[PDB]
Amino acid sequence: DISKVAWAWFGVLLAICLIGAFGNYVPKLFVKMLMFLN
Amino acid sequence: MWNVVGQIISVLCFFILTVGTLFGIVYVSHLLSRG
Amino acid sequence: VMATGCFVGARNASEPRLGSSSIAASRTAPAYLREAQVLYEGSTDGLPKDTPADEIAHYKAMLAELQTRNYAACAGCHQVNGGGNKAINATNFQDAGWQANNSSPGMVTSIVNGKGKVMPAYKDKLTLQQINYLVEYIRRFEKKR
Amino acid sequence: KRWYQKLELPMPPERIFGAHMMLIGGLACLIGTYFFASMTMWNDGYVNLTLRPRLISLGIYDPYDTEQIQRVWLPLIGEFSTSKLPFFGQYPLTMTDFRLFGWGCFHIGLGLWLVYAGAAHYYGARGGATIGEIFWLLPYVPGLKGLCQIKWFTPEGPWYKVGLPWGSFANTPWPILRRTYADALSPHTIYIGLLFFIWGFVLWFVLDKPPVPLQPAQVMTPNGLMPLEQAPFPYGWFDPYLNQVMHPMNTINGETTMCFVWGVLFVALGAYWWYRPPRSINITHLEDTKAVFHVHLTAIGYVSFALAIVGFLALRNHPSYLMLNDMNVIIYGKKIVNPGRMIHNMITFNHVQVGLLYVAAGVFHGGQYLHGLNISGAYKQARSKFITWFQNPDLQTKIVGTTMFVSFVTVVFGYGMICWNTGAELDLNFGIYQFRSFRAIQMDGEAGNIGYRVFRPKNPWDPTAGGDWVKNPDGTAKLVKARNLQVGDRILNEELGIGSSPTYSFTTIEEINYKPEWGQPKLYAVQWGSWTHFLRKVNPLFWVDKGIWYLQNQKTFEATRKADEAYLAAHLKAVSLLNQIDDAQTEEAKQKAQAELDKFRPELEKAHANMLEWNERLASTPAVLYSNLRDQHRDGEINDAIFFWLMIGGWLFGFIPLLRIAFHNYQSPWYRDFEWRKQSPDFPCIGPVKGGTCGVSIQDQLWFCILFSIKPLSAIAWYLDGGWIATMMARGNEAYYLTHNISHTGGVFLYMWNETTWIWTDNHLTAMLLLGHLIWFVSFALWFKDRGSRAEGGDIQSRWVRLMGKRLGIKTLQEVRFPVSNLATAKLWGTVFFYTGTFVLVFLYFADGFFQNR
Amino acid sequence: KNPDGTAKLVKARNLQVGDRILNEELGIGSSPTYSFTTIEEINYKPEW
Amino acid sequence: GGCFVGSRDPNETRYPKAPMPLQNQTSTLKTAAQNTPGAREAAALRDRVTPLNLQQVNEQDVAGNDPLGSPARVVLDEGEMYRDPVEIYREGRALFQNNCVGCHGHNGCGNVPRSTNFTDPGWQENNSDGGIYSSIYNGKGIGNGGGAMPAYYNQLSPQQIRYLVAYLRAFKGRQCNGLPTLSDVERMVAERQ
Amino acid sequence: MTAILLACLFVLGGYAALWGIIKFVVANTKDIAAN
Amino acid sequence: MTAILLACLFVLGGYAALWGIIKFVVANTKDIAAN
Ligand code: 2GO
Ligand code: CLA
Ligand SMILES: CC(C)CCCCCCCCCCCC(=O)OC[C@H](OC[C@H](C[N+](C)(C)C)C(=O)O)OC(=O)CCCCCCCCCCCC(C)C
Ligand SMILES: CNCCOP(=O)(O)O[C@H](COC(=O)CCCCCCCCCCCC(C)C)OC(=O)CCCCCCCCCCCC(C)C
């Protein structure tokens, strides 16, 4: 029975999540965007 | 200078994700139990 | 459902020799100890005359590269057989008291870091997987008492 | 139920008076025995250790006293039959033993006399009392009934048996006596002034420590007669641990001059109140002892808290405790590491405990007086502003809700930062984020010539990046000397010899030529990773401490800064010259380069010596707030910032139930909405209606405050004792803490394990550990929603046992009924068990010794 | 003792049942509440 | 619990030692009893029993912060190290009883799983003194702060680790009843350290 | 003396701070009841 | 096999032993109501 307000919060937390993942797994498995490589 | 700014951004995101997640647990608790 | 498998990653191993899985080799005791003996001895000479041509020459290429980084072989401090040298204080791996009072995990960092004055550090010479193999070979030197 | 409710307020003045006097006499007797247990024939224990630094500062305990005595007051003093000074003539006694003996006997004689006199006021109140009711288990002895039926303390008797001839204070016609508690406020503080004078005269003339500015030019020491300013600590003013002359108000002669300063002030404020005693309408209801009891007990609690803070700072580095570290302190056969700081920490944490317990209890006793006003219909009539200011329920919900919010935000900030940096120190990969550790690599001196293989990116700033290993012109992987690292380089974790971070491969250089603001005087390449070192600055106390400190030390700070700047330039030019050497290619060009670093070596040496010595000086400047184990400046740490946020947030978490006691003892907004009213101050619930209602009463709110406060109280214990509170997993021996000159014993969880290595060395400490753990978890049997189960099952047990008794013939078993705790008495004993279980274990953390580096 | 008055050193082979040895001659610091170890059984070979 | 502790052993004097120096042992600034009735017996007695280097040490003096405290640079001079058995015993038993008993036992034969056992001859013969320093300084095994054998390079000084090294060689061939005594240290030192 | 005064004042300012906060909330929400 | 059989037999024996006690009590207290 979710609100728009809540959906939107959920989208915003999905973004942080994926932004984080991209930074963690993209340089490692492609050897590019080398500022986030570890 | 630039490390510091980068670190502040990660910490913000963590607070947005953990507090944000906790309140979603409450909302979800609320929808199940009632309204 | 959860572990759809389990995402633990791919295993780190040593160098690849064509036609013979290195990852597999790193869990098969008779393969890993053959590479440990090569490192330990600094030559391919004490390897079973049954060794294949490709194997015998891959080992040599491994040694030749390590010889350019001033790698010092384990035998001959510690000898080809253990139980080193009292002169140099080089550890005797045949001794049971030395073997009981070491864990294999603990032994690892003493090879990585070196140990007091003379036993050299191997962290910049060898990979942590090649140190694991050597800890396993040193285990087989033990004698009773 | 009522067994702990025997004596409830209001009481009459003579009965309170008399019991306080009797308790005072009783304490004086216990202290007298503690004086006997201080004598030098005994082992060190916790009781005699917590008094020895004070008895050293007083001159009564003398550490350098070796001679044995044989005649001192009267001709019978080596040793003799039936002791000669009973049970003590067995051992060699010194003069400090005799000084101790005498002060013991003096405290037992005064105490017994005060106990007698208190009893005279207490029982002569009631017109007397018979010997068998005073002592009460004296009529059980047979052939001594007649003895116990005499009447002592009678209003009538001959001089050695009077109590109160007039019956009460109110009836006795001495027209000096004040007649109301506000009028008595003036004599009570003149009286306390007089006590301050007594102490000052005892210190000046009995203990021989006159007041500043009248201290002697000369004082006797074990090495002869010396001048006050060179005589070491117990004798004179020279502090032999810090190597300084003490400030005059940091000696005991300072404390004797304050005896007179405070005594004059109390006498004059008491004479002022004699003439204009307090009279406000806002105060008049406070004559009822139930109401004042709240005020006084909560104030006293605050006083204890302030004793803890004041005593901790004032005495952290004082020679009375450090002197303990020089004696050869052995407890249950061990040998303690830094006993000075251990006993100092015990005394201050003792006081913090007492602080909490009395603020919480004082407020509960407050809520009892208000609840009774509500029961009796008088709350609505009350006239004092100190009640009526808070009568509005809409204001009460705004008070409670905004302190809940302020608590929420400070505790989320602190606990969230702890969680973050423990993630960072552990290198945890979450899929969406890789946490990264702090790592450092020295770039200067000899270390700066060790090489590594470097993966070096092409252009960090643009994506569709790429990198490559650093090579030679022929194509082999070249070794990069730590002096030549750059920001963005990656060095393999395995080649730095790091396991423990298996989810990634490289460490990244994030800053080069880094010099700690406060730490080692070295130059590093660093990975900052996720480690928030800037968080130390998110502390108002960092800035105040460092500002005052900079203002006081500004010239050596300026010369240090300038010596650092000169060394950095000289190191940078050395690295140029070393690089020209390494990249020569012509045996001539090599040789000439080598010639020029050789003639620049001296003066790199000089810039490094200069920098080292200025840094050593700067780090020897006196502390303001944050200190070393010496008494030198340290910069604030992440530890100190987290402590700061945790004190704000965690004391609000603990004290919110006290506000609820204050406002909602009778009706809260939940209650008012249903029209309910709390009928007593201690009911457990009213049952399952509306979901469940356990735990709303003011006695229960009292228990919640105490449990919740366990949390700020453990943060204080961990901080006092040298734990790191800013993460959970921190180890003392790691790169961040050694490069920044930080000593700690732990990391929240990691402290628990690490200190217990020390606890395990002591068999008496481990037996305490086992027991205190048994006490705590049994509290769960009493706090869980479980009491019906327990009563139902205890009924099954009763039945079985009575069956056995009928079958077996055992008359005493045939009517057995096991008692099962009802709900209120369970919550009380469960809280008692939970609290004593935890704080016997916290005692152990202090008692293993103090292990922070000095 | 000896005939000469000084403490005889008893060799472990000649320990008898009843004998007390000082804890601190054996190095034991963990029991500071009693002073001696008592020999309660000599020539003992563990069943297992 | 309180008061009825025992009588103190007459051999443990309380007569006071000199205070720990404020100056760092690693300072480049300026470098590194009476006749009263019983004061000479008490000083002579403190000189054997009361330890001088038991206290945690200044932070600039810890082995990781000392320029000559790394395993590669420390001086293990055998003449200074095995010079005085009183001293090895006075110091190493206090340090060992405090820091090392927890994991290695009250007998020093091993408590924590896989922990060392210092009485074992095979272990003694195959370790150098410099080797023993390395493992105290580095720790043993992989982990944060050392492994299951924790690192001491923040924590202890080079001089404190050296008393530990000499004390540990008194464990050789002892039985599993507590720690080496004063005469174990002395027989160890006579048989060439 | 300096550290003692600082600590004490920092605790006293902790209470004074809170009251001010609470006073701001009360004044700026006068005429909103909280039901 | 011998070890497996011994362990299983001991678990079933604990059950059987409890049954025998609990039935030595029932049989010899049959004239007395528990209460
Ligand atoms: C570590 C070695 C050893 C082992 C064998 C051990 C095990 C266990 C077990 C188990 C089966 O393994 C259990 C179940 C257990 C139980 C207990 N132990 Zn325990 N225990 C040991 C040793 C000890 C010791 C010495 C102590 C406890 C103490 C305690 C206590 C804990 C009492 C309690 O409830 O305490 C809450 C407080 C805690 C956890 C301390 C928090 C410290 C921290 C620095 C506070 C600051 C930061 C926080 C994140 C909070 C911030 C927000 C806030 C301020 C509002 C009970 C009996 C106890 C204690 O922590 O009391 C506060 C105590 O002193 N224990 N303990
Ligand atoms: C020390 C642990 C402890 C012990 C010994 C008990 C004992 C018991 N509980 Mg309690 N309980 C505990 C903790 C413990 N509990 C905890 C932690 C909780 C919360 C979950 C509970 C919650 C609880 C519930 C809800 C109920 C019980 C019940 C019971 C009884 C079970 C009936 C029975 O089978 O007799 C068999 C008896 C035993 C197996 C116990 C033998 C006794 C012990 C080990 C000796 C005790 C030593 C004591 C600590 C030392 C102090 C003595 C001092 C003088 C030396 C039993 C007497 C039931 C009951 O019937 O209530 C009457 C019940 O309904 N327990
Ligand atoms: C605080 C300590 C320092 C000890 C305090 C003094 C006593 C120490 C020694 C233990 C004393 C045990 C006495 C137990 C006893 O006899 O209880 C009887 C009792 O009451 C019933 C009648 C009185 N009606 C009820 C008639 C008025 C009576 O006997 O006086 O009880 C209770 O109801 C409480 C329960 C006591 C526990 C006894 C249970 C014993 C276990 C037996 C189980 C198994 C059977 C088969 C043996
Ligand atoms: C290993 N050694 C660590 C300490 O080293 P070192 O010597 O460098 O430094 C002082 C800190 O030690 C203290 O001095 C603690 C004493 C604890 C007893 C004292 C602990 C009591 C603390 C607070 C008590 C609150 C009570 C009264 C509610 O480091 C300080 O700066 C502490 C200053 C404390 C002030 C914080 C202000 C916060 C405001 C609180 C608001 C609360 C309310 C609104 C409800």
Ligand SMILES: CNCCOP(=O)(O)O[C@H](COC(=O)CCCCCCCCCCCC(C)C)OC(=O)CCCCCCCCCCCC(C)C
């Ligand atoms: C069986 N009768 C019912 C058990 O009543 P409950 O459920 O009420 O719960 C106890 C409560 O404690 C307290 O409310 C403190 C009171 C005393 C103050 C305590 C004061 C401290 C005492 C220590 C002082 C002495 C020392 C210092 C010497 O706690 C527990 O849950 C722990 C379990 C205790 C074990 C019970 C004993 C077994 C008896 C049953 C026999 C069954 C069969 C054979 C048929």
Ligand SMILES: CNCCOP(=O)(O)O[C@H](COC(=O)CCCCCCCCCCCC(C)C)OC(=O)CCCCCCCCCCCC(C)C
């Ligand atoms: C009857 N229905 C009506 C209401 O009942 P109601 O809840 O009032 O009643 C009782 C009694 O008040 C106590 O609570 C007595 C202890 C007070 C001083 C205490 C007096 C003796 C104990 C303490 C003193 C001992 C020392 C000082 C000698 O019912 C209970 O609490 C029954 C539970 C206790 C039964 C024993 C359970 C275990 C025994 C303790 C072991 C636990 C340990 C592991 C800690």
Ligand SMILES: CC(C)CCCCCCCCCCCC(=O)OC[C@@H](OC(=O)CCCCCCCCCCCC(C)C)OP(=O)(O)OCCN
């Ligand atoms: C255990 C406990 C129960 C006992 C508590 C101990 C009490 C000790 C009292 C602490 C005494 C401190 C004075 C020593 C000192 O402050 O030293 C010199 C200080 O000079 C002064 O200002 C002298 C004036 C002191 C007049 C104040 C009286 C205090 C009142 C106590 C009230 C207690 C309550 C009611 C809780 O120097 P600076 O700050 O200038 O320099 C920095 C030092 N590096």
Ligand code: HEC
């Ligand atoms: C130049 C001599 C030398 C070479 C080459 C040498 N070692 Fe050592 N090693 C020593 C000496 C000396 C010690 C004794 C260390 C000490 O002081 O305790 C020792 C010690 C050891 C120990 C025991 C460590 C422990 O913790 O207890 C192991 C395992 C070991 N070496 C393995 C190796 C391996 C594997 C190699 C080759 C990869 C190797 N060594 C190469 C001389 C050498």
Ligand code: HEC
């Ligand atoms: C936390 C437990 C713990 C503490 C505390 C501890 N140790 Fe150990 N120690 C171990 C374990 C486990 C080993 C076995 C390491 C291995 O082989 O895995 C060990 C091994 C050693 C070794 C042998 C090292 C080698 O290479 O052969 C020495 C020497 C040592 N410890 C000395 C000490 C001394 C001295 C102290 C106190 C300073 C101390 N230990 C404290 C657990 C600990």
Ligand SMILES: [Ca+2]
């Ligand atoms: Ca401690």
